[PDB]
Amino acid sequence: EEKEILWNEAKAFIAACYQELGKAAEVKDRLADIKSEIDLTGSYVHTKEELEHGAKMAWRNSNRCIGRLFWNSLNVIDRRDVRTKEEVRDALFHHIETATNNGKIRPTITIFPPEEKGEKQVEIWNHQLIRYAGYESDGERIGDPASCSLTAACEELGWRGERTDFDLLPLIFRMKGDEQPVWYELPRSLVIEVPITHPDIEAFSDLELKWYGVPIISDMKLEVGGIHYNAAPFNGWYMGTEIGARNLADEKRYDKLKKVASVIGIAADYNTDLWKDQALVELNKAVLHSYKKQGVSIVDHHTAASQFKRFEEQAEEAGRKLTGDWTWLIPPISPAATHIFHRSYDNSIVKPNYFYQDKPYE
Amino acid sequence: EEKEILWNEAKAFIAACYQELGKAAEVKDRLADIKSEIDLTGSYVHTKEELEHGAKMAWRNSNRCIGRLFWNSLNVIDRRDVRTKEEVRDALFHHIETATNNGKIRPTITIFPPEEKGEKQVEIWNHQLIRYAGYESDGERIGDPASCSLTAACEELGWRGERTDFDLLPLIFRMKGDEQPVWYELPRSLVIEVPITHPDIEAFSDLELKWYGVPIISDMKLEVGGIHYNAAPFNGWYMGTEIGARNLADEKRYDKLKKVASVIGIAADYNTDLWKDQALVELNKAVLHSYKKQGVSIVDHHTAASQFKRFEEQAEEAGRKLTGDWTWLIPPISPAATHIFHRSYDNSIVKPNYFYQDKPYE
Ligand code: HEM
Ligand code: HEM
Ligand SMILES: O=[N+]([O-])c1cccc2c(Br)n[nH]c12
Ligand SMILES: O=[N+]([O-])c1cccc2c(Br)n[nH]c12
Ligand SMILES: [Cl-]
Ligand SMILES: [Cl-]
Prior knowledge:
Chains A, B: Heme binds at residue 65. Chain A is an alpha+beta fold.
């Protein structure tokens, strides 16, 4: 059964991947080979080409991603060789550096060894590689609530944050055979960060907001032809709204709108003033401007959605069915000003793809 | 079969309605009575109490309505007696007047005679009772595009708009047995309208925006215990965002954002300025302010969503399952600033309810 699901995912996967790559004749033989390898080993190993392209497909089938126009240019780094924690840490450091590229961000994915009998070789605990600690000590909230549980896990283990609102979490992961993960402080030279300033309103700096340059999702599994790469951290660049509208705005995260409001000189007393809407727009403007001012790559949600419309034309022109989760594609501000809003999307799962998995802390 | 679906909807309906009204013992007998009436007539007639409460339930089960907190106070007007077009017109005029209430708007529904063998007694063509004409004469767009097809139907029939951007459409409906509908010009004394002005920016009047006070959906069917009231126009008051974010903003409707932008003294050249977001917020502010300034009832989307949260607590406290279409509940601006956004809703159909039906023009 295990063999059988694996075998089928593999057949589907190879046929489609080789078809896309104009390598259709080579399929019979490659499958034969795989049929033997799974017969013998109970698994099979991807070629470099298969793995690069699988990862590309997985991004392309990510229903919740608006920035899939650029799926085919994903930078794929194949680290299936790593056996030691030093190599993992160092692969992680490298990915941060190469993806950041001095602020001209490259969409990158580092792929570590797959699961064996569903036995993990590496288990990355961070949610993102770069992320801020969250504390809560008797109703004194500090930093990022979303990170509270992970943060108290690190602290268990030895780490100690400075309790700033933007403490950098360390990398923390576990190796097959170890009962505990290790952690390693993030070198600061690696992490680009941006202060938030407004183009017009100088008192805006008084807020002392900043955010990190690159979002690198480090806790989703990549599945490709029945192979489960549980550790395969990936990145793009940010759409502004995720910083300015979620991370900084949500009540459960940084909860900045009142302060935004106060410092932009509007009152926060009456819903009918639309002071949250208005703050949200100045804050999202502050975000794009600061990242563009710093030479760090970013997209606004309007631009992003025009990109995603090209993606839609291109799927269909390529004869590919489109999938999409409307609830995630629409941006959290001015969604009706994007075409995404006015159409519907088929939310089926096509593999290859990225998937959630259980957190090991909690 | 017809009898059978009708009979079952009826059983479900009566049991639930009488249960809610503490009239559970009276059910056996009322059903017996109905069983006879459908045996004989092929249909059955609602009591005043059943009909009032059915209409209330239908609003309560309207998954796409954020303003369901007020379902139980719906004003129900029972016009199952009307036989003539003069009575229909006059029922319509009355509803406009009584629902408007000098701007203190009363949620009201006028219920005309049901379908017979699915044969309509009255067929209302308007989408809303109060709505603006749309023209398009060789790439000269006038008024409201959404109304283009209806408008050319009236014009067929004799009506002639002044070709302003806010021409009032006439009432137009058809009576069983007539091959054509009639139309009747809307008396102007009946229709409250609001000019849009900004609280701060006086040049805002230069835009010469206005909108009508009361939205009255006149082309959906109400179903109650298997009875199909195809003509049962209903109203609430407006959430600002529907005017300020859809009606006035969408490209396919009035398409005002550039102009908004120009008159609020920001440039409309770069997506990264968030000039659509910013215009949308000043325009939605202009809308609430003008309606509150005029003594016309309106709700902002934040207030609305806090109301809808009480509705959610109240369903559950009453032991009722909640339903909801997330895609409609979220507002089209600052949706992530409402709790609606951060939860999910079950989109099943529970009857009684309001439903779409085929347009007769087009
Ligand atoms: C190049 C720039 C990129 C942009 C601007 C972008 C934008 C986004 C945004 C805005 C979301 C919504 C997520 C949220 O609301 O938290 C998202 C989700 C996602 N994106 Fe992308 N993305 C990019 C690159 C990538 C890459 C490189 C991959 C994979 C290789 C990817 C896979 C996904 C996935 C799987 C999700 C859903 C994640 C989840 O469940 O939380 N995207 N994307
Ligand atoms: C009292 C104030 C009311 C407010 C503020 C309100 C608000 C809304 C809003 C904002 C929508 C979204 C529709 C759109 O995006 O076009 C909506 C939909 C709807 N509401 Fe309400 N509503 C109210 C009263 C009513 C009443 C009285 C009824 C029925 C008796 C009702 C039934 C519905 C239905 C059926 C829909 C979906 C209509 C469609 O498919 O286009 N609501 N409501
Ligand atoms: O840009 N975003 O707001 C955003 C959200 C979630 C995941 C990603 C990645 Br991987 N690149 N950008 C992202
Ligand atoms: O207020 N709204 O934006 C809105 C939208 C659609 C239907 C209705 C009614 Br009936 N009252 N208010 C409505
Ligand atoms: Cl993020
Ligand atoms: Cl409307």
